[PDB]
Design a protein around this ligand. Structure first.
Ligand SMILES: [Ba+2]
Ligand SMILES: [Cl-]
Ligand code: NA
Ligand code: NA
Ligand code: NA
Ligand code: NA
Lengths: 175, 175
């Protein structure tokens, strides 16, 4: 077990977690203004995102808050409490994402224009707000600016492969 | 200052705080699902809200997170660290609020239809995201469900009057 104490301790960390609503997420603090993530279970499962710009601060010792807005229109605020293996996230979904979640299920980086066209075309209100705690199931020190971390679409067995030490090498690159 | 340990300690607390951009806000935890607030500084100074529904939780001992979405379309995630006199809030404004702030500068509770109509008529994107720490300059033990706390429009010297103990009586009523 390592104690998370500084912003530097947190950056470069690679998380897997399950929300209290059953939803399984994966998230990486690439650097101090960039996040990658990959969704395994729930409404928008299969979706993954690299190079998302984000405000990342340490609130107080060992507690980390991350904010970003998405090309879909989705707003996010994550609070990591890694010394307790816990997280809290609020996701503010536009109405169209709840109605048509599969539109967002893709490699978003290749379909930015689709997301921007969708968010203006389809309904935004009422919003779906998902305020939930999560248990952290995996913590890896990937280092900052590591391109191998979230570099492919999710598959059924992927979270287990990572948790079991059968996905990355000693240097945290994929085999 | 009292030590905040539990969710109970937090509920019924009346705050005034200045964000790092200089924006003075005031905010009250009326109950476990309801917030009242009043704005004294910045883009939407003069705006006040009551009976806004919100998700309110204790993240970890003495740290609190509040999530709500507004009739304006605005998304808010607030993190309180009252034992440090520090807070962090992320506000996600629709483009239209940045472009027409003065529509929202009113008692919202009397102009709900105008807010809902404007969020549909004007632009949602790009969002203006305001990630900032605040310094807490006032903490009042207002008790839960006190309708007097935020019951009038802000005036210039109002935060001073509250800080200076000239606004409420001994039972935390305006008079
Ligand atoms: Ba698709
Ligand atoms: Cl509101
Ligand atoms: Na995104
Ligand atoms: Na990556
Ligand atoms: Na203040
Ligand atoms: Na303001």
């Amino acid at each position: 077990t390592k104690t998370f104490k500084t912003l530097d301790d947190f950056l470069g960390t690679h998380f897997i977690y399950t929300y209290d609503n059953g939803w399984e997420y994966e998230w990486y603090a690439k650097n101090d203004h960039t996040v990658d993530y990959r969704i395994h279970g729930g409404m928008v499962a299969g979706r993954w995102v690299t190079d998302q710009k984000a405000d990342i601060v340490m609130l107080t010792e060992g507690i980390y808050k991350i904010s970003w807005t998405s090309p879909t229109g989705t707003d996010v605020a994550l609070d990591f409490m890694p010394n307790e293996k816990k997280l809290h996230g609020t996701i503010f979904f536009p109405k169209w994402v709840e109605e048509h979640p599969e539109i967002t299920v893709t490699y978003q980086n290749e379909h930015i224009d689709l997301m921007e066209q969708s968010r203006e075309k389809y309904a935004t209100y009422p919003k779906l707000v998902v305020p939930e705690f999560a248990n952290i199931t995996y913590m890896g020190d990937a280092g900052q600016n590591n391109e191998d971390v979230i570099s492919e679409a999710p598959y059924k067995e992927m979270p287990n492969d990572i948790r079991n030490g059968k996905y990355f090498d000693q240097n945290y690159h994929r085999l």
